[PDB]
A paper describes a structure:
Forkhead box H1 ([name]) is an essential maternal pioneer factor during embryonic development that binds to specific GG/GT-containing DNA target sequences. The members of the FOX transcription factor family share the presence of the forkhead domain (FH), which interacts with DNA (InterPro entry IPR001766). In contrast, [name] recognizes the TGTG(G/T)ATT sequences in several cis-regulatory elements, such as in Gsc, Eomes, Nodal, Mixl, and [name], to confer activin regulation in vivo.
In contrast, [name], also a pioneer factor that binds to canonical forkhead motifs, displayed the opposite behavior and selected only for DNAs with TT sites, even showing a decrease in its melting temperature in the presence of the GG site. We observed that only high FL-[name] concentrations could displace [name] from the DNA. These findings corroborate that [name] and [name] interact with TT sites, although the former has the distinct ability to recognize GK sites, a rare feature among FOX proteins. To explore the impact of the protein-DNA interactions on the DNA topology, we compared the DNA shapes of the [name] complexes with other FOX structures available in the PDB and with the pair of complexes we determined here for [name] using Curves+ 43. Small differences were detected at the major groove, whereas the minor grooves were found to be slightly wider in the [name] complexes than in other FOX structures. A similar absence of interaction between Asn and the G-C pair could account for the DNA binding preferences of [name].
Residue numbers in the entry: 153 to 238
Write the structure that this text describes.
Amino acid sequence: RSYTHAKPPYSYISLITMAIQQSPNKMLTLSEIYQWIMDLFPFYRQNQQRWQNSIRHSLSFNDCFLKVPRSPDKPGKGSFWTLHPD
DNA sequence: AGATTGTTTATTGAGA
DNA sequence: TCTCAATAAACAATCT
Ligand SMILES: [K+]
């Protein structure tokens, strides 16, 4: 049987920012961001289709998130995302 | 191909 | 009314 959780009081900027700040390298992949968010806020275990679309939109749309490429000799899926140094 | 990641554009909704 | 946040969606790049 399923259970209603209430949306926590954070914008996607805030959610992403917190995820990154917490990370030991100060950077996370997109899927790591998803993980951190879901692990912590069970509200986000539903409707993953739309809220993840929002996250992706946020990373690209907002200048405060910076794409870090993976090393040539350490390849993988997607880039890391860190905070713009502003 | 098939899915994930990323970008971009347009709309919509909420709150001041 | 107007800005900004969130949503929806089209389409490309890049992984599996
Ligand atoms: K960006």
